[model samples]
Target: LATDKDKLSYSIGADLGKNFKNQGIDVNPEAMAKGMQDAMSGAQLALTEQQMKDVLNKFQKDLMAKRTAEFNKKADENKVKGEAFLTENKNKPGVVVLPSGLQYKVINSGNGVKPGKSDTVTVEYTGRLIDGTVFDSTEKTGKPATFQVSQVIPGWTEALQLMPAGSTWEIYVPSGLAYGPRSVGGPIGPNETLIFKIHLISVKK
Candidate 1:
């Protein structure tokens, strides 16, 4: 049990088990072990490679369909919740709601020029979900992010074009302007309304 081979095998098993469970995969331990055993022992497998491929391919397709259905259901719910939240949020002082449903509040006003759609801009930002779940931030990288004003989400593109360099603003993006009906994976779900605290640093044409 203390051997190197034993440790490596156990580690692989543990890692695979965690991944399977995380994905809600219902796996048969006996069958899985048997397959591994037969493959390693150079014995004939119960199913041919072609059959195995077909089985796994079908499972993957089914899983994708299931996930899509789940996301559609959740996306509908999120849309309603986001609408309600934004409706209430717009009433807050200093919060300006654009016709596109993108909202923002100036944290610090700057006198410098704003970035155009084709211009590259440097900024520090923290992005979060409505529940205050921080999904991404410049703090983790310890460096400001640089990108063209048009290369970001629709809401961000619009906001960045209006935000002067050296200004800081808190932006609220509707689902339509964010990643509608699609997820970035992990904490960012489909049709999610996003929030960001953005500090514009500089712009280059």
Candidate 2:
């Protein structure tokens, strides 16, 4: 009837049709017309649904396999590099390797009270990849950020508890304690190790 409702319905149908066509899946117009007919009558599909299903299944499987391979490769490489970095990092005079395998070198010791896992604290930090590429920084925000001791990554939780307010330390976080094998879809790669220079500013009571 060319009513407004018909126009909106046609828009939705067109969007759905675009989704199918954009996937490069061929759905013949005749078969589609028959499908519309069948849907109204509860009749069998005029198109070969099995063939579309098979193609889609194979496509998904291949894409998943390729992604898994890339992720695994990045994870392995990160593990090796992180281990090697920790080995060298521990040899530095002031750097301490904790029981959790997290490493830190104190830049300045703060006289303020230390924080526990459940306690929130304010901090200024600059985080980087091992290659010295900056990923994030509190300075960029122009102020310290407040977070619970348990709110950060594992390596951070371990070291932040050991630091007092006004203290600064360079922390080396292993991939397992960082983002693990998950990529943030940004500059940070999967299973990446991170280096952070964090200054404890205040501990909220």
Candidate 3:
């Protein structure tokens, strides 16, 4: 039920969203919408596009400390939460915590060869937050996911190596071992623990 003008506006918005996504920037939609409105309504620009480049460069030059102050706060929050969750989880029956801080419970210990870093492995996994909210899955990927062990997050790499072929495990990965501060879009936060139900289907050398 969109008019031509409405479709044009939506198309432009989609283009803007794509630009930020391609550049790996997490945009605040409200801010972006307001900025676009202000600019379109003839608001004067405070800084030239040329001007922001130097300040952005300055922050990068300073090792992101100036730009990343609040994310540091968020990351610290997850650090404490992860520690508490792990402490509680370790006491549960059959839960194991490795020296590297990875935790897992073997759901099915298949009688098969274990995989190594060099092998391209296939897995069916469902990832979640500590609160058990699902983030992603490969249950309907049509094919088991195929990837080298080094291509995944650190926790996945460690967990994959420990798992035997056809094994299924419930995994817990701390922030540093997960996507620490490197935000991908949606549901994933600045620093968060990751949970997964992983099935190691194969290890193709």
Candidate 4:
């Protein structure tokens, strides 16, 4: 016996409940219903507008603090994991670890040309995490990527400066040289150590 309006109202409540649950909000259903009824009926609200604003602001501040703590904890854990992995990886044959903790192994050496910081270069690359989760690749789009040498992450910029055209290198980037303490969407998380197989194509000076 539910009318269209009743069903729509129930749907709205269900959607709102879902969002609140996702945000870790503990809602008082009875109070929420009362508020909605009062609002719809043009009745006086229990809380003044200023009081509502103050409560909402306080809630937002607390929620932000909670989320920031969570992000920091995750970032700290990632940093430790990356350091341990890099320390062990550097011992592998052909893996050259730089003073800044960036590492690379020449896969196919080339003598064509090296790129400068201001030079643009074409490359095909596949990027992954330490666990071998491929987050991105040029193969996905079937085209080589072209960008300025200095426009990439610190590790990529440094590595590309030394890479000659037609060289392929497996680059290991430390978190500090990568995103560093901030998540940049996709499979990349805070302080993630990244691996990339980069094939340098051509350089435009």
Please state the error at residue 161 of candidate 4 in Å: 1.3
Q: How accurate locally, in lDDT, is each candidate?
A: 0.93, 0.86, 0.84, 0.93
Q: For each candidate in turn, give its C-alpha RMSD to the true structure in angstroms.
A: 3.4, 5.6, 7.6, 1.8
**Residue clash pairs of candidate 3:** none
Q: Which pairs, if any, clash in model 4?
A: none
Q: Put down candidate 1 lDDT per residue, 1-205, tens digits, no spaces.
A: 6999999999998999999898899999889999999999999999999999999999999999988888889999899888888999999999999989999999999888999999999999999988999999999999999998889999999999999999999999998998887766778787789999999999999
Tell me which residue pairs clash in candidate 2. Answer: none
> Model 2 compared with the native: what TM-score?
0.74
In what order do the candidates fall by TM-score, top score first? 4, 1, 2, 3
Better of 3 and 4 by TM-score: 4
The CA root-mean-square deviation of candidate 1, after full C-alpha superposition on the true structure, stands at: 3.4
Better of 2 and 4 by lDDT: 4
Model 2 segments beyond 4 Å from truth? 1-49
Error of 2 at 70 (Å): 1.0
lDDT of candidate 4 over 100-120, digit per residue (tens): 889999999999889999999
Tell me the tens digit of each residue's lDDT in model 3 across 59-151.
466655634765678778877888899899999999999988999999999777787888889888899988888988897675677889988
lDDT by residue for model 2 (151-183), tens = 889999999889988999999998888888887
Error of 3 at 179 (Å): 1.2
- Of 1 and 3, the candidate ranking higher by TM-score: 1
Model 4 stretches with alpha carbons more than 4 Å out: none
Q: How many clashes in each structure? A: 0, 0, 0, 0
Q: Specify the poorest-scoring 10-residue window by lDDT in model 4.
A: 179-188
